[PDB]
From Swiss-Prot:
<dbReference type="GO" id="GO:0050829">
    <property type="term" value="P:defense response to Gram-negative bacterium"/>
</dbReference>
<feature type="disulfide bond">
    <location>
        <begin position="64"/>
        <end position="80"/>
    </location>
</feature>
<comment type="function">
    <text>Lysozymes have primarily a bacteriolytic function; those in tissues and body fluids are associated with the monocyte-macrophage system and enhance the activity of immunoagents. Has bacteriolytic activity against M.luteus.</text>
</comment>
<dbReference type="InterPro" id="IPR023346">
    <property type="entry name" value="Lysozyme-like_dom_sf"/>
</dbReference>
<dbReference type="GO" id="GO:0003796">
    <property type="term" value="F:lysozyme activity"/>
</dbReference>
<keyword id="KW-0326">Glycosidase</keyword>
<keyword id="KW-0732">Signal</keyword>
<feature type="disulfide bond">
    <location>
        <begin position="76"/>
        <end position="94"/>
    </location>
</feature>
<dbReference type="InterPro" id="IPR000974">
    <property type="entry name" value="Glyco_hydro_22_lys"/>
</dbReference>
<comment type="similarity">
    <text>Belongs to the glycosyl hydrolase 22 family.</text>
</comment>
<keyword id="KW-0964">Secreted</keyword>
<dbReference type="Pfam" id="PF00062">
    <property type="entry name" value="Lys"/>
</dbReference>
<feature type="active site">
    <location>
        <position position="35"/>
    </location>
</feature>
<dbReference type="InterPro" id="IPR001916">
    <property type="entry name" value="Glyco_hydro_22"/>
</dbReference>
<keyword id="KW-0020">Allergen</keyword>
<protein>
    <recommendedName>
        <fullName>Lysozyme C</fullName>
        <ecNumber>3.2.1.17</ecNumber>
    </recommendedName>
</protein>
<dbReference type="GO" id="GO:0016231">
    <property type="term" value="F:beta-N-acetylglucosaminidase activity"/>
</dbReference>
Amino acid sequence: KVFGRCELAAAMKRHGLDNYRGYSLGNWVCAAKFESNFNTQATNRNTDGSTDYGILQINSRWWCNDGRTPGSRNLCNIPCSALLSSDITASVNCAKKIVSDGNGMNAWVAWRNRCKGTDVQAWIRGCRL
Ligand code: NA
């Protein structure tokens, strides 16, 4: 599923991401825009052989099981395929564990490089929330 901007903001708010660990909703929408262009089916292969999945490009190295990432963990206790669902529950619940890991949203290199320090509230401008 490719979300609309405000559609995804509303889904992320309903799933409790707005100000989760102090990160306003615009931060999460911004991160999803640059990770996946709001496409739940986005996948990307990393140099190390791990794969990133879903709207927030969650990595198989630590967070999900894909059966093809040697020596990896599954700390969200999910198949990586659940992160591709039209239902964002699995991506949101796993993102809450990641952002709680110590480095906040710096876990998402695209958030650090494209969202951090910017006017992220622009991403939820105009939305009914
Ligand atoms: Na894994």
